[PDB]
């Protein structure tokens, strides 16, 4: 006698899915995600047009931002988006490949679930195959020289990593700009870089060829007076934080005026303080002062009469950027200024644009600077965003190269070699674990097949030909010719990829597959 009671507060409005149905649904969702994020892989892949909620159009090629801007609702899709975000935050390049690898690994595991294999054994075999591939990939790792003199391998790697986005017309120019920015902000004594010193500014107008770097700091302001000189040759930067106002404490103060003498003294001091501060600023012999706040009315006229240009409304990171580039020190008041707290300039000329009233001030020609700015030019906002994303990806790639100081042979040879090594190692493992290694090796070959499908050639035929050519000779560098050059050797085509990045991608994909193969229940309201 069991009447239908009530246990959960929302039992009548909740679904339950146990058994292998939840795992099958998760595998299907992962396969659908991998198929959706499949065409955006390789040099022949097209871009994706994203539509925002308010109505903004964003066309990009990076898989990380595409997956992030998709506000879905499934748990597997959210897990894949989080995995792609973590991969982009750790490495920076190859965000659309880890998801494809995870989908290919989860697709091949569906046959073992229907045949009669426990998911724990599948996860153990996948982890063993991933460890074997990681241990084998470090044997074919060639170390290249990286320094300030020879920059050919870095330029080649930056050009190879930037052959799929819309910013491919310059190629050599963007790679040179990136390697120059890296050599400027390198810090070889600690083997790390800082992205807070490299500022990227984008504006409408111009073309992609006019994206020349500027060895200095650029601001988006102008002079406070139109009758001031725009360009100067010999100027001394003087960055200050106190405004051009009379002193006033932040506490509660009240001034009392009794007779006419007090009012006269106050009226005299009102201009005496300004005259004293002007004389103190002029005594240091500076030629270009920089204040944090704005100016009033008498201070600007005094600075114009004394022939001393100044910049208004510049109290952000531009102060520290200029202090790092030129070499000056920030001062708190006006007394401590006549010492060695000034910055040497070289060319401070206010540039112009088209018919609009947009005036920007730039500072170039400096000494041993440790911060450079890149001025992006284009014809559309999406073009500027894509150029900024490509520059960030190139910077991350060069940072990984600096941190690793060694590369391998990418393209379509490393995955095939890893699959061959896994298949060879699986022949000496007779303990039911040979089925997972074969699936792991077959899932790793999804990159050359996708590349050949996106190029326009036969995938399986080219894969078999490359495998035969690699097993016949002793050159593990023959990949898939996506540019139709007639040579399948990736060494002559200067195809350089990262090793630690690929290792981290493989490890993250294996961990995600193991985590997915463990969940089999779902309870949603």
């Amino acid at each position: 006698y069991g009447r239908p009671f009530l246990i959960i507060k929302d039992q009548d409005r909740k679904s339950r899915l146990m058994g292998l149905e939840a795992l099958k649904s998760h595998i299907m969702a992962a396969k659908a995600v991998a198929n959706t994020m499949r065409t955006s892989l390789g040099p022949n892949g097209l871009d994706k047009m994203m539509v925002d909620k308010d109505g903004d159009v964003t066309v990009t090629n990076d898989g990380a931002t595409i997956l992030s801007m998709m506000d879905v609702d499934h748990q597997i899709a959210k897990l894949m988006v989080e995995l792609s975000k973590s991969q982009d935050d750790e490495i920076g390049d190859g965000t659309t490949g880890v998801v494809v690898l995870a989908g290919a690994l989860l697709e091949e595991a569906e046959q073992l679930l229907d045949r009669g294999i426990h998911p724990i054994r599948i996860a153990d075999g996948y982890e063993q195959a991933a460890r074997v591939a990681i241990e084998h990939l470090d044997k074919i790792s060639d170390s290249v020289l990286v320094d300030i003199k020879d920059t050919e391998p870095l330029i080649q790697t930056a050009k190879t990593t930037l052959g799929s986005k819309v910013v491919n017309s310059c190629h050599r120019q963007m790679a040179e700009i990136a390697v120059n920015a890296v050599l400027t902000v390198a810090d070889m004594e600690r083997r790390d870089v800082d992205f807070e010193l490299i500022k990227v500014e984008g504006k409408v107008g111009g073309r992609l060829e006019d994206t020349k770097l500027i060895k200095g700091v650029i601001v988006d302001k102008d002079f406070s007076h139109p009758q001031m000189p725009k360009k100067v040759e010999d100027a001394k930067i003087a960055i200050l934080t106190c405004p051009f106002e009379p002193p006033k404490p932040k506490t509660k103060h009240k001034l009392d005026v009794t007779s006419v003498e007090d009012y006269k003294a106050l009226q005299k001091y009102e201009k005496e303080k300004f005259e004293e501060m002007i004389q103190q600023i002029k005594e240091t012999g500076a030629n270009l002062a920089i204040c944090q706040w704005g100016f009033d009315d008498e201070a600007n006229h005094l600075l114009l009469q004394n022939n001393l240009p100044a910049v208004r409304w510049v109290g952000g990171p531009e102060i520290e950027l200029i202090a790092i580039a030129t070499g000056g020190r920030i001062v708190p008041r006006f007394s401590e200024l006549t010492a060695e707290k000034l910055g040497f300039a070289g060319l401070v000329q206010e540039i112009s644009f088209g018919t609009t009233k947009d005036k920007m001030l730039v500072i170039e020609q400096c000494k041993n600077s440790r911060a450079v700015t890149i001025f992006i030019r284009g014809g559309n906002k999406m073009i500027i965003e894509e150029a900024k994303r490509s520059l960030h990806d190139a910077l991350c790639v060069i940072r990984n190269l600096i941190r690793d100081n060694r590369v391998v042979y990418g393209g379509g040879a490393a995955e095939i070699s890893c699959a061959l090594a896994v298949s060879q190692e699986a022949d000496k493992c007779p303990t039911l674990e040979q089925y997972a290694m074969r699936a792991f090796a077959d899932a790793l070959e999804v990159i050359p097949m996708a590349l050949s499908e996106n190029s326009g050639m036969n995938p399986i035929q080219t894969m078999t030909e490359v495998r035969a050519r690699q097993v016949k000779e002793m050159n593990p560098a023959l990949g898939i010719d996506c540019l139709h050059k007639g040579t399948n050797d990736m060494k002559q085509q200067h195809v350089i990829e990262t090793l630690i990045g690929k290792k981290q991608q493989i490890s993250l994909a294996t961990q995600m597959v193991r985590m997915i193969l463990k969940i089999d229940d779902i309870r949603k309201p």
Partner: protein
């Protein structure tokens, strides 16, 4: 995936639901098992009250919407239609077997081995039942039928007054025995008239030696007491003659319309005169009789009963040796009536029993009939008494047809459980646990009997098991197997000399039906319900 447009269940969800439904069905009818349990009450939506506790009626009037419970309902209905007694015990046994097999299924055991073990245990129990048999004709005989009828009427409303009811049932069965090929003693039931009339109590419900009719006399001028009368069975309407649809009347001569209208009424008069030419007194008609035809029977001093049922007329013609004549035609072309096919009753007295009257017919000269007029309080008591009488008649018929009796109670089930436990040591395969579960499922009848009696159940069960184990081994104590179960005090007694008597055809059939139901239900693990 899988576009079905309907709710489905795969796994342990449908099995648990079926187990819960079977448990609820068993617990619903678990308050009227044995002579200790009381009755039930079923009320509809208009105010009609129905008091019953037979088992099949409770499952029929309950509005069951689940298939797992509908299977048990139709099984109980088939069991009640077959034998007539033991409708709740079979359902309880089937529910206990299902609950015991669910635990084995949930223990990572294939249902095929469990089904095979259950079939083997059922076959062993059937083969062991024929060993413990007592011939009713080898002992006293007359004292066994009374005990069986008292046991069958021990869990009804007439539990105390069962001494006279048993004798009445025995007399009715002895008087209703028919004669056929004279090879096997056949005792057909559903042949007595069970009339329900309020008024007197239960001790004033005597047995009438003859057939009773639930009809009154036609006209008030007809007598109501004719001694040594003749019963005439007719099967045609005794009204005015009317032509068929394909036969019309076209009046072309006014000198013949009056003659035709006079003949249309004189034909019936001539037919009545030819029928009553042999000196008939009791005339039974199934159809309606016109008011003009009753005057002849009134003036002739005879009785004419109309609206008589076909079964009652057939039983009257069979008891009195008459022949129901559907027409007056013979082997020639003239309607003649003979006196060789007429009844011969003793005395027909129309006695008034509580406002309404009824015609009573005593025994004749061909065969002997019987009728039991039960008198209750209101309407539910009469229905309960009729149901108890029918159950007692069915039990007596089954006992007389089986020619054997088995002491019922908590003895046969315990003996079968002990025999199955002693037999599980020989089966060294995977069917060892199935026999144990089958033996443990049979011990649910004494548990329920002790629970309904509000007494100690575990101690009594242990004592019965110890007694059965002591009676099985050692041939010097083979007379301890007839202990039974006495719920009046809570101690074993003698259930063979003067205790509980039950036939052997009820236990075997119920056990086989419960096993078949458990087998046909345990093979279900996928439910698909389409949307209307």
């Amino acid at each position: 995936p899988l576009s079905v447009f309907g709710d489905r269940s795969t796994g342990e969800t449908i099995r648990s639901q079926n187990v819960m439904a079977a448990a609820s069905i068993a617990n619903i009818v678990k308050s009227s098992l044995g002579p200790v349990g009381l009755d039930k009450m079923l009320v509809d939506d208009i105010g009609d009250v129905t008091i019953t506790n037979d088992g099949a009626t409770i499952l029929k009037l309950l509005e069951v919407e689940h298939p797992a419970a509908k299977v048990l309902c139709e099984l109980a209905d088939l069991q009640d239609k077959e034998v007539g007694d033991g409708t709740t015990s079979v359902v309880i046994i089937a529910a206990e077997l299902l609950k015991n097999a669910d635990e084995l299924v949930k223990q990572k055991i294939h249902p095929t081995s469990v089904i095979s073990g259950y079939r083997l245990a059922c076959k062993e129990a059937v083969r062991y039942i024929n060993e413990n048999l007592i011939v009713n004709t080898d002992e006293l005989g007359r004292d066994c039928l009374i005990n069986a009828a008292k046991t069958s009427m021990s869990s009804k409303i007439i539990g105390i007054n069962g001494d006279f009811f048993a004798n009445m049932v025995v007399d009715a069965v002895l008087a209703i025995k028919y004669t056929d090929i004279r090879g096997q003693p056949r005792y057909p039931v559903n042949s007595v008239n069970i009339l329900k009339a309020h008024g007197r109590s239960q001790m004033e419900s005597m047995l009438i030696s003859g057939y009773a009719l639930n009809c009154v006399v036609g006209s008030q001028g007809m007598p109501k007491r004719i001694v040594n009368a003749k019963i005439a069975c007719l099967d045609f309407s005794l009204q005015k003659t009317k032509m068929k649809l394909g036969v019309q009347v076209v009046i072309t001569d006014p000198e013949k319309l009056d003659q035709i209208r006079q003949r249309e009424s004189d034909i019936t008069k001539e037919r009545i005169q030819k029928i009553l030419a042999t000196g008939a007194n009791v005339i039974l008609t199934t159809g309606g009789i016109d008011d003009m035809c009753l005057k002849y029977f009134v003036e002739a001093g005879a009785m004419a009963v109309r609206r008589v049922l076909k079964r009652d007329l057939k039983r009257i013609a069979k008891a009195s040796g008459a022949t129901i004549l559907s027409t007056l035609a013979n082997l020639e072309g003239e309607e003649t009536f003979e006196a060789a096919m007429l009844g011969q009753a003793e005395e027909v007295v129309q006695e008034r029993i509580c406002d309404d009257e009824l015609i009573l017919i005593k025994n004749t000269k061909a065969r002997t009939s019987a009728s039991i007029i039960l008198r209750g309080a209101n309407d539910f008591m009469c229905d309960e008494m009729e149901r108890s009488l029918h159950d007692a008649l069915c039990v007596v018929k089954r006992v007389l047809e089986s020619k054997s009796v088995v002491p019922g109670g908590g003895a046969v089930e315990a003996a079968l459980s002990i025999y199955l436990e002693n037999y599980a040591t020989s089966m060294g395969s995977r069917e060892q646990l199935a026999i144990a579960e089958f033996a443990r499922s049979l011990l649910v009848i004494p548990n329920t009997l002790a629970v309904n009696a509000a007494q100690d159940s575990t101690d009594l069960v242990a004592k019965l098991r110890a007694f059965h184990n002591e009676a099985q081994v050692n041939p010097e104590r083979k007379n301890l197997k007839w202990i039974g179960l006495d719920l009046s005090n809570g101690k074993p007694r003698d259930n063979k000399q003067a205790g509980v008597f039950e036939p052997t055809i009820v236990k075997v059939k119920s056990l086989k039906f419960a096993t078949e139901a458990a087998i046909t239900i345990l093979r279900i693990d996928d439910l698909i319900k389409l949307h209307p």
